Design a protein around this ligand. Structure first.
Ligand SMILES: CSc1scc2c1-c1nc(SCC(=O)C(C)(C)C)ncc1CC2
Length: 147
């Protein structure tokens, strides 16, 4: 089980990574973003983490931009109190990688391609999604136009 550390407090995984309770505690994680409609909130009944579900599918019609601001406020809440955040979806981490890159574009001022090269360097297997790609391109333009 590999929870990829993108930033010192931001971790990226899939469904399998999200079920390793011991590693999550070793990484000082206290926040979890579940970017699926159907997976459970793993370890919810143990009362150890704050959870947020963004109910998305890995399709060519899913809107992920709508969840960006909601996800950034949760990331910054963990960031500001010294805890780690895990964001995960499924196999090819397409959905969760979109939100991670969007954060890097907004809160690190990286371009879209520099953000992708940074993420791909730490987690080499990332499945493409042309729809999510197109939304990050419009997100980059809205950042550059102060919107
Ligand atoms: C911003 S992504 C990007 S920018 C320039 C390229 C790419 C790219 N990405 C991917 S996979 C990553 C994804 O599709 C999501 C994270 C959006 C789900 N495969 C191939 C390429 C070719 C070149």
């Amino acid at each position: 089980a590999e929870l990829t550390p993108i930033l010192p407090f931001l971790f990226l995984g899939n469904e399998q990574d999200a079920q390793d309770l011991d590693t999550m505690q070793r990484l000082n994680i206290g926040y979890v973003i579940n970017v699926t409609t159907h997976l459970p909130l793993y370890h919810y009944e143990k009362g150890l983490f704050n959870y947020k579900r963004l109910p998305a599918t890995d399709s060519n019609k899913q809107n992920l931009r709508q969840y960006f601001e909601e996800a950034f406020e949760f990331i910054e809440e963990a960031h500001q109190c010294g805890k780690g955040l895990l964001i995960h979806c499924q196999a090819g981490v397409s959905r969760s990688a979109t939100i991670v890159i969007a954060y890097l574009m907004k809160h690190t001022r990286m371009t879209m391609t520099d953000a992708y090269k940074f993420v791909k360097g730490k987690r080499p297997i990332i499945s493409p999604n042309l729809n999510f790609m197109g939304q990050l391109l419009e997100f980059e333009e809205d950042l550059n136009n102060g919107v």
